[PDB]
């Protein structure tokens, strides 16, 4: 087949129900998904080729980066209850991993200060019991699948990309064939 079951993807042993259709992972430590974000905008290019309105979830994870791993998870969950993440992902991807300026969570703060969010707003959500049931949801969604690794992308909660047997010679043929890929799993 074209596509088969552990070349352009894998599927999980143990199926997720009840999932959204299409589920990414990622850190804001993880090289990679700087790449994925960056420079291939995979999200949006998936999104491009699936039909209009489909969900499409991003979530933040713990095990990388240790305790400022899990502020930024804790800010991610305000990105997302504050419907901030474009104006955030590009200013802590370049404060962790290329400036190196993004140490403590007051660094994390100031990323959000910068992109115009209120102080008083963005101290009240990172509070908010609404931000800590977003941090379990995005806990949970990675126990629910095994995840060790990111960058990941899980579609309709059975099936997991797998990017390294996809072409790399060239960027734009990668994302192609990525989100080809992630439209397929989708209409499976």
Known sequence: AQYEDGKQYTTLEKPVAGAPQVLEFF????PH??????V????????KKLPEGVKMTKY??????????????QAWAVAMALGVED?????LFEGVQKTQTIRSASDIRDVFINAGIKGEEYDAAWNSFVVKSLVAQQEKAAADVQLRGVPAMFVNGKYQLN???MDTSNMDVFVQQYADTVKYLSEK
Not at 33 to 38: A, P, T, V
């Open 87 to 91: 104006k955030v992902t590009v200013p």
């Open 163 to 165: 990017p390294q047997g």
């Open 27 to 30: 850190s804001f430590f993880c």
């Open 60 to 73: 933040h994870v713990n095990f990388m980066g240790g305790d400022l791993g899990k502020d930024l998870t």
């Open 33 to 38: 998904c700087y790449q994925f974000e960056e």
């Open 40 to 47: 291939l905008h995979i999200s949006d290019n998936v999104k």
